[PDB]
Ligand binder design. Sequence first.
Ligand code: NAG
Ligand code: NAG
Lengths: 50, 50
Amino acid sequence: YTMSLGVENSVAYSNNSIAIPTNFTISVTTEILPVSMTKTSVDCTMYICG
Amino acid sequence: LTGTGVLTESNKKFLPFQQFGRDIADTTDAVRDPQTLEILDITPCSFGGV
Ligand SMILES: *[C@@H]1O[C@H](CO)[C@@H](O)[C@H](O)[C@H]1NC(C)=O
Ligand SMILES: *[C@@H]1O[C@H](CO)[C@@H](O)[C@H](O)[C@H]1NC(C)=O
Protein backbone atom coordinates (compact mmCIF):
# COMPACT_ATOMS: atom_id res chain seq x y z
CA TYR A 1 0.00 0.00 0.00
CA THR A 2 0.98 3.66 -0.17
CA MET A 3 1.70 4.35 3.52
CA SER A 4 -0.46 6.60 5.71
CA LEU A 5 1.25 9.77 6.93
CA GLY A 6 -1.35 9.94 9.80
CA VAL A 7 -4.84 11.26 10.72
CA GLU A 8 -5.78 13.88 8.08
CA ASN A 9 -7.04 16.49 10.57
CA SER A 10 -7.55 20.24 9.97
CA VAL A 11 -7.35 22.78 12.84
CA ALA A 12 -10.68 24.63 13.34
CA TYR A 13 -9.00 28.09 13.02
CA SER A 14 -10.73 31.48 13.25
CA ASN A 15 -9.90 34.99 14.38
CA ASN A 16 -11.62 36.01 17.71
CA SER A 17 -11.58 32.39 19.05
CA ILE A 18 -9.05 30.36 21.08
CA ALA A 19 -8.90 26.87 22.56
CA ILE A 20 -7.70 26.61 26.21
CA PRO A 21 -6.97 23.35 28.08
CA THR A 22 -9.30 22.66 31.03
CA ASN A 23 -7.44 19.55 32.25
CA PHE A 24 -4.01 17.90 31.91
CA THR A 25 -2.05 14.69 32.34
CA ILE A 26 1.31 14.07 33.80
CA SER A 27 3.02 11.71 31.37
CA VAL A 28 6.05 9.52 31.98
CA THR A 29 7.99 8.39 28.86
CA THR A 30 11.16 6.36 28.43
CA GLU A 31 14.12 7.54 26.41
CA ILE A 32 17.20 5.28 25.93
CA LEU A 33 20.76 6.29 25.01
CA PRO A 34 23.86 4.09 24.63
CA VAL A 35 27.03 5.25 26.49
CA SER A 36 29.74 2.56 26.04
CA MET A 37 31.02 -0.04 23.63
CA THR A 38 32.48 -3.24 25.07
CA LYS A 39 36.13 -2.24 25.76
CA THR A 40 37.97 -4.51 23.29
CA SER A 41 41.65 -5.15 22.56
CA VAL A 42 43.50 -7.33 20.03
CA ASP A 43 47.05 -8.57 20.37
CA CYS A 44 47.67 -7.98 16.65
CA THR A 45 50.86 -10.10 16.80
CA MET A 46 49.14 -13.16 18.29
CA TYR A 47 46.02 -12.64 16.14
CA ILE A 48 48.10 -12.59 12.92
CA CYS A 49 50.86 -15.09 13.81
CA GLY A 50 49.61 -17.62 16.46
CA LEU B 1 48.55 -31.50 13.39
CA THR B 2 50.73 -29.23 15.58
CA GLY B 3 49.70 -26.70 18.23
CA THR B 4 49.93 -25.31 21.78
CA GLY B 5 47.03 -25.42 24.29
CA VAL B 6 45.50 -26.88 27.50
CA LEU B 7 44.73 -30.59 26.90
CA THR B 8 41.62 -30.94 29.13
CA GLU B 9 39.36 -34.02 29.49
CA SER B 10 36.34 -34.06 27.09
CA ASN B 11 32.76 -35.34 27.00
CA LYS B 12 32.39 -34.37 23.27
CA LYS B 13 30.10 -36.71 21.26
CA PHE B 14 32.51 -37.76 18.48
CA LEU B 15 30.82 -39.77 15.72
CA PRO B 16 32.76 -42.96 14.70
CA PHE B 17 34.37 -41.57 11.49
CA GLN B 18 35.32 -38.13 12.97
CA GLN B 19 39.09 -37.50 13.52
CA PHE B 20 39.00 -33.99 15.11
CA GLY B 21 36.59 -31.16 16.03
CA ARG B 22 36.75 -27.39 15.31
CA ASP B 23 35.39 -24.23 16.80
CA ILE B 24 34.26 -21.41 14.41
CA ALA B 25 37.77 -19.85 14.04
CA ASP B 26 39.10 -23.02 12.22
CA THR B 27 40.77 -23.66 15.66
CA THR B 28 40.79 -27.42 16.30
CA ASP B 29 39.09 -27.67 19.72
CA ALA B 30 39.12 -31.49 20.17
CA VAL B 31 41.06 -34.54 18.83
CA ARG B 32 40.60 -38.30 18.85
CA ASP B 33 43.97 -39.42 20.23
CA PRO B 34 45.63 -41.69 17.53
CA GLN B 35 47.28 -44.14 20.02
CA THR B 36 44.18 -44.48 22.27
CA LEU B 37 40.81 -43.41 20.84
CA GLU B 38 39.90 -41.12 23.79
CA ILE B 39 38.69 -37.57 22.94
CA LEU B 40 40.82 -34.64 24.19
CA ASP B 41 39.50 -31.09 24.81
CA ILE B 42 42.00 -28.52 23.44
CA THR B 43 40.94 -25.77 25.87
CA PRO B 44 42.51 -22.29 25.16
CA CYS B 45 45.83 -21.70 26.99
CA SER B 46 45.67 -18.31 28.78
CA PHE B 47 47.17 -15.04 27.48
CA GLY B 48 46.70 -11.33 28.30
CA GLY B 49 48.13 -7.81 28.25
CA VAL B 50 51.06 -6.71 30.42
C1 NAG C 1 -12.85 37.95 12.14
O1 NAG C 1 -13.90 36.95 12.10
C2 NAG C 1 -15.26 37.50 11.96
C3 NAG C 1 -16.25 36.34 12.06
O2 NAG C 1 -16.09 35.71 13.35
C4 NAG C 1 -15.32 38.25 10.62
O3 NAG C 1 -16.60 38.89 10.48
C5 NAG C 1 -14.25 39.36 10.57
O4 NAG C 1 -14.30 39.99 9.27
C6 NAG C 1 -12.85 38.79 10.85
N1 NAG C 1 -11.89 39.89 10.98
C7 NAG C 1 -10.60 39.74 10.71
C8 NAG C 1 -9.68 40.93 11.01
O5 NAG C 1 -10.16 38.69 10.25
C1 NAG D 1 -9.16 15.87 35.19
O1 NAG D 1 -9.22 14.47 34.77
C2 NAG D 1 -9.44 13.48 35.85
C3 NAG D 1 -9.40 12.08 35.23
O2 NAG D 1 -9.52 11.08 36.26
C4 NAG D 1 -10.77 13.81 36.53
O3 NAG D 1 -11.00 12.91 37.64
C5 NAG D 1 -10.72 15.23 37.11
O4 NAG D 1 -12.00 15.51 37.72
C6 NAG D 1 -10.40 16.27 36.02
N1 NAG D 1 -10.16 17.56 36.65
C7 NAG D 1 -10.51 18.71 36.09
C8 NAG D 1 -10.10 19.98 36.86
O5 NAG D 1 -11.11 18.75 35.02
